PDB file of C-alpha atoms (C1' of nucleotides) in Angstrom:
ATOM      1  CA  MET A   1     -14.004 -10.475  -3.585  1.00 62.60           C
ATOM      2  CA  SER A   2     -11.239  -8.610  -1.089  1.00 62.71           C
ATOM      3  CA  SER A   3     -12.956  -8.424   1.387  1.00 63.56           C
ATOM      4  CA  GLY A   4     -16.109 -11.338   0.841  1.00 65.27           C
ATOM      5  CA  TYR A   5     -18.849  -8.871   2.004  1.00 68.42           C
ATOM      6  CA  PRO A   6     -21.566  -7.296  -0.487  1.00 70.36           C
ATOM      7  CA  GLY A   7     -19.924  -3.191  -0.090  1.00 71.36           C
ATOM      8  CA  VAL A   8     -16.432  -3.437   1.467  1.00 71.92           C
ATOM      9  CA  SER A   9     -13.319  -2.878  -0.890  1.00 72.92           C
ATOM     10  CA  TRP A  10     -10.121  -2.593  -0.454  1.00 73.15           C
ATOM     11  CA  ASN A  11      -8.482   0.574  -1.732  1.00 70.27           C
ATOM     12  CA  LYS A  12      -5.275   0.116  -2.716  1.00 72.86           C
ATOM     13  CA  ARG A  13      -3.674   3.602  -2.703  1.00 74.98           C
ATOM     14  CA  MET A  14      -5.207   4.545   0.983  1.00 72.21           C
ATOM     15  CA  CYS A  15      -4.307   0.865   2.276  1.00 71.97           C
ATOM     16  CA  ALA A  16      -7.682   0.785   3.716  1.00 69.88           C
ATOM     17  CA  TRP A  17     -11.162  -0.534   3.459  1.00 71.75           C
ATOM     18  CA  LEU A  18     -13.805   1.364   2.064  1.00 70.83           C
ATOM     19  CA  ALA A  19     -17.560   0.734   2.845  1.00 67.95           C
ATOM     20  CA  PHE A  20     -20.052   1.759   0.226  1.00 66.76           C
ATOM     21  CA  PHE A  21     -24.250   2.418   0.984  1.00 67.38           C
ATOM     22  CA  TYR A  22     -26.736   4.088  -0.266  1.00 64.28           C
ATOM     23  CA  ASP A  23     -27.763   7.178   1.547  1.00 69.02           C
ATOM     24  CA  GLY A  24     -31.648   7.266  -0.362  1.00 70.84           C
ATOM     25  CA  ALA A  25     -30.285   7.446  -3.675  1.00 71.31           C
ATOM     26  CA  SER A  26     -26.694   9.270  -3.100  1.00 73.57           C
ATOM     27  CA  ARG A  27     -23.647   6.530  -3.252  1.00 74.40           C
ATOM     28  CA  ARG A  28     -21.044   7.446  -0.475  1.00 73.63           C
ATOM     29  CA  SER A  29     -18.109   5.646   1.871  1.00 73.09           C
ATOM     30  CA  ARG A  30     -16.413   5.162   4.456  1.00 75.84           C
ATOM     31  CA  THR A  31     -12.773   4.949   5.308  1.00 76.81           C
ATOM     32  CA  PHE A  32     -11.568   1.915   7.910  1.00 74.43           C
ATOM     33  CA  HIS A  33      -8.048   2.046   7.641  1.00 75.59           C
ATOM     34  CA  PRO A  34      -6.085  -0.903   9.832  1.00 76.66           C
ATOM     35  CA  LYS A  35      -5.648  -0.103  13.240  1.00 77.01           C
ATOM     36  CA  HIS A  36      -2.371   1.753  14.683  1.00 76.53           C
ATOM     37  CA  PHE A  37      -1.480   1.905  10.844  1.00 78.56           C
ATOM     38  CA  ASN A  38       0.306   4.889  11.039  1.00 80.65           C
ATOM     39  CA  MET A  39       2.177   4.124  14.756  1.00 83.83           C
ATOM     40  CA  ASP A  40       3.107   0.641  12.790  1.00 84.54           C
ATOM     41  CA  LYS A  41       3.931   1.351   9.619  1.00 86.00           C
ATOM     42  CA  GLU A  42       6.253   4.234  11.143  1.00 83.55           C
ATOM     43  CA  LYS A  43       8.035   1.401  13.268  1.00 82.26           C
ATOM     44  CA  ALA A  44       8.308  -0.303  10.755  1.00 81.65           C
ATOM     45  CA  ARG A  45      10.434   2.501   8.363  1.00 82.28           C
ATOM     46  CA  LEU A  46      12.540   2.884  12.117  1.00 82.27           C
ATOM     47  CA  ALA A  47      12.953  -0.414  12.329  1.00 84.82           C
ATOM     48  CA  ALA A  48      14.467  -0.809   7.992  1.00 86.58           C
ATOM     49  CA  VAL A  49      16.604   2.551   8.823  1.00 85.35           C
ATOM     50  CA  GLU A  50      18.287   0.829  11.466  1.00 87.95           C
ATOM     51  CA  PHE A  51      18.820  -2.495   9.334  1.00 87.07           C
ATOM     52  CA  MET A  52      20.066   0.102   6.875  1.00 87.39           C
ATOM     53  CA  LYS A  53      23.027   1.658   9.320  1.00 89.85           C
ATOM     54  CA  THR A  54      23.934  -2.110   9.828  1.00 91.58           C
ATOM     55  CA  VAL A  55      24.571  -2.180   5.923  1.00 91.26           C
ATOM     56  CA  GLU A  56      26.137   0.772   4.989  1.00 91.20           C
ATOM     57  CA  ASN A  57      29.368  -0.528   4.404  1.00 89.66           C
ATOM     58  CA  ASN A  58      31.672  -2.138   1.840  1.00 90.80           C
ATOM     59  CA  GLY A  59      32.226  -5.032   2.742  1.00 90.36           C
ATOM     60  CA  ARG A  60      30.727  -8.514   2.076  1.00 91.27           C
ATOM     61  CA  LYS A  61      27.467  -9.276   3.673  1.00 95.05           C
ATOM     62  CA  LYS A  62      25.979 -11.692   6.231  1.00 94.19           C
TER      63      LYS A  62
ATOM     64  CA  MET B   1      12.782   8.754  -0.289  1.00 94.64           C
ATOM     65  CA  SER B   2       9.281   8.118   0.371  1.00 94.27           C
ATOM     66  CA  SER B   3      11.064   7.717   3.841  1.00 94.37           C
ATOM     67  CA  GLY B   4      13.612  10.215   5.483  1.00 96.56           C
ATOM     68  CA  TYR B   5      16.212   8.034   4.401  1.00 98.77           C
ATOM     69  CA  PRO B   6      18.492   7.030   2.004  1.00100.92           C
ATOM     70  CA  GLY B   7      17.916   3.313   0.044  1.00101.36           C
ATOM     71  CA  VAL B   8      14.543   3.306   2.700  1.00102.13           C
ATOM     72  CA  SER B   9      11.933   2.933   0.036  1.00106.25           C
ATOM     73  CA  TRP B  10       8.149   2.352   0.450  1.00104.56           C
ATOM     74  CA  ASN B  11       6.792  -0.390  -1.809  1.00102.82           C
ATOM     75  CA  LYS B  12       2.968   0.229  -2.420  1.00101.34           C
ATOM     76  CA  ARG B  13       1.839  -3.757  -3.963  1.00 99.45           C
ATOM     77  CA  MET B  14       3.770  -5.113  -0.677  1.00100.84           C
ATOM     78  CA  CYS B  15       2.708  -2.500   1.689  1.00100.11           C
ATOM     79  CA  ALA B  16       6.367  -2.283   3.332  1.00 99.57           C
ATOM     80  CA  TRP B  17       9.390  -0.939   3.620  1.00 99.93           C
ATOM     81  CA  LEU B  18      11.690  -2.179   1.433  1.00101.49           C
ATOM     82  CA  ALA B  19      15.762  -1.496   2.635  1.00101.16           C
ATOM     83  CA  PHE B  20      18.237  -2.041  -0.252  1.00 99.36           C
ATOM     84  CA  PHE B  21      21.866  -2.597   0.415  1.00 99.50           C
ATOM     85  CA  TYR B  22      24.642  -4.184  -1.479  1.00101.43           C
ATOM     86  CA  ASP B  23      26.625  -7.433  -0.531  1.00101.38           C
ATOM     87  CA  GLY B  24      30.128  -6.460  -2.494  1.00103.33           C
ATOM     88  CA  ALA B  25      28.433  -7.296  -6.640  1.00104.73           C
ATOM     89  CA  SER B  26      25.185  -8.079  -5.419  1.00106.07           C
ATOM     90  CA  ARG B  27      22.149  -5.756  -4.621  1.00105.58           C
ATOM     91  CA  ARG B  28      19.885  -7.379  -1.812  1.00101.00           C
ATOM     92  CA  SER B  29      16.821  -6.333  -0.351  1.00100.25           C
ATOM     93  CA  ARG B  30      15.173  -7.082   3.342  1.00101.00           C
ATOM     94  CA  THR B  31      11.178  -6.303   3.704  1.00100.54           C
ATOM     95  CA  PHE B  32       9.856  -4.265   6.705  1.00101.34           C
ATOM     96  CA  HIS B  33       5.912  -5.030   6.768  1.00 99.94           C
ATOM     97  CA  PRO B  34       4.083  -2.872   9.684  1.00 98.28           C
ATOM     98  CA  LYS B  35       4.064  -5.206  12.710  1.00 95.67           C
ATOM     99  CA  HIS B  36       1.009  -6.802  12.834  1.00 95.20           C
ATOM    100  CA  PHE B  37      -0.208  -5.730   9.469  1.00 93.94           C
ATOM    101  CA  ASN B  38      -1.779  -8.754   8.225  1.00 98.55           C
ATOM    102  CA  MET B  39      -4.063  -8.873  11.612  1.00 98.15           C
ATOM    103  CA  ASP B  40      -4.951  -5.308  11.739  1.00 98.45           C
ATOM    104  CA  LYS B  41      -6.294  -5.066   8.503  1.00100.54           C
ATOM    105  CA  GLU B  42      -8.596  -8.128   9.220  1.00101.66           C
ATOM    106  CA  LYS B  43      -9.873  -6.652  12.537  1.00103.79           C
ATOM    107  CA  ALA B  44      -9.929  -3.303  10.102  1.00104.90           C
ATOM    108  CA  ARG B  45     -12.245  -5.541   7.615  1.00103.81           C
ATOM    109  CA  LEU B  46     -14.295  -6.609  10.398  1.00103.68           C
ATOM    110  CA  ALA B  47     -15.346  -3.434  11.084  1.00103.29           C
ATOM    111  CA  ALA B  48     -16.043  -2.445   7.912  1.00105.31           C
ATOM    112  CA  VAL B  49     -18.306  -5.460   7.755  1.00102.70           C
ATOM    113  CA  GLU B  50     -19.881  -4.238  11.129  1.00106.29           C
ATOM    114  CA  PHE B  51     -20.521  -0.387   9.640  1.00104.40           C
ATOM    115  CA  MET B  52     -22.292  -2.243   6.542  1.00100.58           C
ATOM    116  CA  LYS B  53     -24.817  -4.204   8.339  1.00102.49           C
ATOM    117  CA  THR B  54     -25.497  -1.817  10.312  1.00101.96           C
ATOM    118  CA  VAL B  55     -25.571   1.704   8.519  1.00100.02           C
ATOM    119  CA  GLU B  56     -28.028  -0.613   5.722  1.00100.37           C
TER     120      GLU B  56
ATOM    121  C1'  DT C   1      -7.542  13.318   4.388  1.00100.83           C
ATOM    122  C1'  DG C   2     -11.973  11.282   3.398  1.00102.87           C
ATOM    123  C1'  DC C   3     -14.426  10.939   0.842  1.00106.13           C
ATOM    124  C1'  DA C   4     -17.973  11.330  -3.501  1.00100.47           C
ATOM    125  C1'  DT C   5     -17.906  10.247  -8.201  1.00 98.37           C
ATOM    126  C1'  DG C   6     -15.461   8.173 -12.125  1.00 98.24           C
ATOM    127  C1'  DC C   7     -14.472   4.234 -14.682  1.00 98.47           C
ATOM    128  C1'  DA C   8     -16.055  -0.319 -17.074  1.00 97.83           C
TER     129       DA C   8
ATOM    130  C1'  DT D   1     -21.093  -2.816  -8.418  1.00 99.15           C
ATOM    131  C1'  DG D   2     -15.924  -2.877  -6.675  1.00 98.99           C
ATOM    132  C1'  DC D   3     -12.195  -0.107  -6.625  1.00101.94           C
ATOM    133  C1'  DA D   4      -9.084   3.958  -8.883  1.00103.75           C
ATOM    134  C1'  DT D   5      -9.485   8.383  -8.584  1.00102.05           C
ATOM    135  C1'  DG D   6      -9.968  13.898  -8.025  1.00101.83           C
ATOM    136  C1'  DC D   7     -10.631  17.235  -4.696  1.00104.68           C
ATOM    137  C1'  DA D   8      -7.020  22.104  -2.284  1.00109.21           C
TER     138       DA D   8
ATOM    139  C1'  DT E   1       5.684 -14.915   0.936  1.00110.16           C
ATOM    140  C1'  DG E   2      10.864 -11.849   0.291  1.00112.34           C
ATOM    141  C1'  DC E   3      13.297 -10.862  -2.707  1.00115.03           C
ATOM    142  C1'  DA E   4      16.183  -8.781  -6.067  1.00118.99           C
ATOM    143  C1'  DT E   5      15.936  -7.154 -11.338  1.00119.37           C
ATOM    144  C1'  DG E   6      14.225  -3.690 -14.342  1.00122.90           C
ATOM    145  C1'  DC E   7      13.898   0.905 -15.965  1.00126.84           C
ATOM    146  C1'  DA E   8      15.335   6.432 -14.863  1.00123.96           C
TER     147       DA E   8
ATOM    148  C1'  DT F   1      18.708   5.377  -6.739  1.00121.27           C
ATOM    149  C1'  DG F   2      14.178   4.750  -5.939  1.00123.84           C
ATOM    150  C1'  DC F   3      10.289   1.473  -6.201  1.00123.46           C
ATOM    151  C1'  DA F   4       7.312  -0.836  -8.987  1.00124.51           C
ATOM    152  C1'  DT F   5       7.405  -5.403 -11.216  1.00128.01           C
ATOM    153  C1'  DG F   6       7.895 -10.501 -12.237  1.00125.65           C
ATOM    154  C1'  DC F   7       9.223 -14.824 -10.334  1.00120.90           C
TER     155       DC F   7
END
DNA sequence: TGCATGCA
DNA sequence: TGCATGCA
DNA sequence: TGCATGCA
DNA sequence: TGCATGC
C-alpha cells in the first residue's frame, strides 16, 4: 500500500492522505495534507524563483 | 506558468518545483521540493491512521 | 477546498 | 477496497 | 532520487 | 515554453 494501513490512501492530485471510513452505510473521507504544506510549498517556490534569476543569462553555467 | 514566474514549473508526480534553464546549448533543470516534505507527509500519514483507529 | 462517489 | 474524479 | 528529453 | 515522462 501507499500508507500501509487499511482505509488510508495517498490522493496524488490533492497531495494528501485521505482516511476512508464507513458512517453507518455511507462511505466518507477525511483529508490529511502534510503539515505546513502551503507554507513549505510557497517557500520552495521562492527558492526556485531565486535560483531561476541566478541563471537568467546567456553565458555558460556553474 | 504554475509558479508566478517564467521557467519555474510544478512537477505533479515529483511534488516539486523545477527551474528550467540553459547552460549554453544544453537545457538543464534543478529540483526544489518543499523543505520538509518527507517528514511532514509522514506526520500526516500517522494522523490519518490515528483518525482511522479513533473514528472506527 | 474537502469531500463523496465513481471506477475496476 | 485503493485512489481518481467531479463538484461551482 | 534528480534530471533533461519529448511534445506542443 | 511549460511540464509530463523515462531513465
